[PDB]
Amino acid sequence: KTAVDSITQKKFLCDRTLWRIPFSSNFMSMGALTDLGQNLLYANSAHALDMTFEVDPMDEPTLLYVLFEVFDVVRVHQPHRGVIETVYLRTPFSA
Amino acid sequence: DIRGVLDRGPTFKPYSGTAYNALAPKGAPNSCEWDEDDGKKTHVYAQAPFAGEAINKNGLQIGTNGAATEGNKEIYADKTYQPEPQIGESQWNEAESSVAGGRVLKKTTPMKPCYGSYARPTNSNGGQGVMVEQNGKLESQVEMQFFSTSVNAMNEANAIQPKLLLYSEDVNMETPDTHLSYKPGKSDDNSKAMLGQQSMPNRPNYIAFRDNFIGLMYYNSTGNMGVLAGQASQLNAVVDLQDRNTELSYQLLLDSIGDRTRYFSMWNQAVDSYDPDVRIIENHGTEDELPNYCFPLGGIGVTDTYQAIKATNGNGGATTWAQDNTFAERNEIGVGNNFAMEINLNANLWRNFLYSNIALYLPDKLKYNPTNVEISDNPNTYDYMNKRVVAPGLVDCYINLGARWSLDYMDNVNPFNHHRNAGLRYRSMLLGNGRYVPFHIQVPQKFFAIKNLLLLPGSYTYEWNFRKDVNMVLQSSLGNDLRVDGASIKFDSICLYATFFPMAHNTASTLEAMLRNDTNDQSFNDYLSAANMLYPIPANATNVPISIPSRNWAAFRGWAFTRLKTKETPSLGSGYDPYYTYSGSIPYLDGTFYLNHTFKKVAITFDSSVSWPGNDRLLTPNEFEIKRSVDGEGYNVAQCNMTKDWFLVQMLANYNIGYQGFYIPESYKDRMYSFFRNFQPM
Amino acid sequence: RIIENHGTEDELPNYCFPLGGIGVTDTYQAIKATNGNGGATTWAQDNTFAERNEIGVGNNFAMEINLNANLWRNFLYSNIALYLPDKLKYNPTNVEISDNPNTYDYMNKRVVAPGLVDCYINLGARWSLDYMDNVNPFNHHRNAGLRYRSMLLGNGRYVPFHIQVPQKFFAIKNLLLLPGSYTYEWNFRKDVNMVLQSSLGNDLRVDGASIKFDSICLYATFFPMAHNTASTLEAMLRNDTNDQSFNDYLSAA
Amino acid sequence: EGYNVAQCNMTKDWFLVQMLANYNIGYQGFYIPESYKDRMYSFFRNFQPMSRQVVDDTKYKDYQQVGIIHQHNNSGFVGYLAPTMREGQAYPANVPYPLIG
Amino acid sequence: QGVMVEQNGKLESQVEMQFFSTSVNAMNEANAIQPKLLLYSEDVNMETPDTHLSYKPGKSDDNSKAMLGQQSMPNRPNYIAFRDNFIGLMYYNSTGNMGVL
Amino acid sequence: LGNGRYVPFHIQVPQKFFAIKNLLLLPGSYTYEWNFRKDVNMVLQSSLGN
Amino acid sequence: DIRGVLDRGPTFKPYSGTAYNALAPKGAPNSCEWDEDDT
């Protein structure tokens, strides 16, 4: 009978995972490659990238971890006896 | 294959609580004695549990032999091991005897509470007197003391007889695993008050090898990139860079290709996990509606003597009464309910659990230093963490009652660095609970580029490296540095094993020939397949820019991100770091993360003037919203703070679900490190 | 729902103890043995030790209790006993009680003896009581899902809430719908008996709980299909040979 | 000191044999077999390795053997070789040897 | 629970009333001889179903003051049932009584 | 079987032999004869092993 | 299909602990009275 006036608060926990945004036209996964990536505006072009984050403050130096999923494939060829050669390659962002 | 020697140092605490006089009350001192002024006399506090037969100047008589000489010569106490603290009466009433006895520590031995007091044995019968060398031999220093009543001296009973006897000895007192809660005196000399100091066990701490032996072998880093190559090639066949977390890689992949809940011994495969109850407090409250009562050992305390009475007929008047002769004149009865005590049970259990599992792990900015105790100044060592003060009133049965919630202080603290971590307990116990372990392991290859190659006959050089640091290759529950405490390790024997197959000769020849042709080369990709960038953030800031100049964007697949707490995040590239002190569970390699719930928004742009995906795809014009705090007009979902749009995007990109109405995705398509599995709204 | 009685494992008694770890003691005085002059050994009061000391004789005084039986009895009383039908109770003593047999108080103020169910009922037999069969087992605080739902809103009393409701009618829960312009109007309920639910089954209209809507809105999505393909599908999906069939699950009278 | 495997007293080769005969697994590097292939009575479900440490009796010169009927811990609060009424007096313990600190 | 015994061809009881006052006032003046405690005594078929005596003071059997110290302890549980799949009900693999279809 | 000293019991026992467990039988008349144990040890099981 | 009557005997006990004045302390006696030889 004698409770008080109150307010409400909400939040959530999503540990043990990463936030992933795919590079797809309609966000759906339809193969290892992707339509926008395959278009690249046809790769006679190039582009510069800007990204902006805004997060709540803490009280300690922190790190922002960002990774771009790209292609990283290696081909192995061993022609003669006791000889092995390989070719790595990866894109974009590689060398 | 590796064998060698490992020493964990002093700060290894496998078992919670303690195991030295566990049942004793946490404040009662044991038998002892100390000194006072006028005039320096000695006060003694003890108790004699064991009865005997008789006393004389040579000691206590505890038996006799018929076949002896002096009538039946009296057998006395061989002070070495006589009346032992583990003997006593044999029933609750147990009519009192005439002469008793016991043991007592002398004043020279420092006082300590009973709860957690250990002294090693000295002779084969459990004696504990400090053996001392006299005259070229070993001998003991037991001293017998005698006592009689007080009023004994007050009257003509001058025939004062020795009624009580004690044996005084010295021991090597040790308290391996507890500290002192309260200590009134700054000095250490045993006062009278020093009979009140109470103890408290040290917080438990597990230490072992990390999951899947992560960190043993070098990897992503020119530190010394290992080499597999042809025996006379003189040209390498393996190239690695410095932005390919090979490890996070092997990691997630295991996940996928199978199941993780089952542990496998050989590779120490035991995923770090946290109990659901530790993270979120399901404060249903206690359960009690009945009283609980302890009782006297006889179930009747008081007693009033009484007397049998027989009714003699009062004829023509009031009945008369006389004393019976059949009964004994004195009998004992009681009136009313037997005296007892009340206590709540469930509330105590719940309170113990809450205090032990959550309180001690609170952020350290809410703990104040203790009183009258020494302590270190380095805020990282085991000592400084085991001797702070935590207000139990901060969390008790009356916090967030009947709600599904987590204490907002805790949610920015690594929940995996804990002591209920089942995987941690498994790994720690596998090596055993000692302090000096000769160990023996087998390590798997993890580089994707050759972890599934099919080599062909020949000769090759296979050369690799391993780390010696103790900060990284080990794991500690409390995360305290180990360079300071100094756990050591030394490898001795390292050997390699390989497993061929018994294939028929000509078949192997045919396959090898068919496989040497160039149009049958092998291909591989890493399951992760990504880069690795990291960006600093000064404390108490809000927003971060990132800009990469003009370049190509062939076949780019997309982004993923999260957050990390500097301190605990080895820098990488280099083969060693003097600055790494912490030693919790490294999020950057194990796959544990806890910071995700702390984002507001993120925006993406090409050449600073074109949005993406843009063209009015989403509800907001040009910015991804993750959670707007309260003011949000129509943009929450599932009673959380998350926007509908972000929820939709995550659902789609994780399972291709959403355009046909949401619903729980099926099991196999949602593994341990999925999204939906770990989505707790509160 | 069913009781697996076993007794318990309580073969070692448990004793509590005094805070000093020793019961009571009787001041005593030290002595020493003045050497027996041939005959009786002489005894002289010492001076080294003070005139008073504390010493105990025999075991320390210690009250005692059992543990497991008490826990089990508490569980049995608080999970089963309270839920018997009313006809096995009586009004309490000297306190005004509720007169309506539906509201909260009449479900609370009543008193049920332990004697009906204790640690000695159906000793060791997987079995369920007789009076309990015809009483629902879902209306019970031990429920998990109900507890989760109750926590989801929160612990308060005056709560602002904001949710979404999925359409459930079979005939349109999966239909498609080519382009057009149609009307969707529906009606929502407002009684507290229906929408809400109580773990005890008391009435809620009498106890004054209520609810009121403020604003209400409708959402929806699409699939950014390329225009021409959508045109082709729209044209194809109109040849009456390609009607759509639907059938609810249960289907019956 | 050549052939122990999986942190136990069992040699590697026997492990290889059992894994083969159960699941035809081993020429492709050991790994957890799939759930449906392994049932209740199978081998890998019932494989429990354990180890412990005990006090050496040659290095620790102070060590002395102690019979059961002289050991005493939690004295003055429990029985004596029988679950009877509590007995004894308080005192420091004499067992077991500590392995930490 | 009082024992019933037959006399006069009928089954009756053997409850007796005994009276007690304070020997506590054993000594003093007359008149003040008033009872304060009434006890009803009986005899009952004492019977223990599932307990055994852990402690016993003396090898005798009569009722002394010492006998109050005796301590009891429950009997270990002992389950009994049919085996799994009724193993053993039907003979097999024995030439003595091979079944016939 | 409950927790009684005396119990009336009433059960069904399957057929375990492999030579007839999955056989498909054909029309006709046949003789079917078998045996059962009465020993109290083998049929029963006791937790303690007494 | 089989029907019969089975007797486990006396030594069948399916419950840990006991069910008779269980809460009472394990040494407390009962209200009694006994004879003693006069002195």
Ligand SMILES: [Ca+2]
């Ligand atoms: Ca009295």
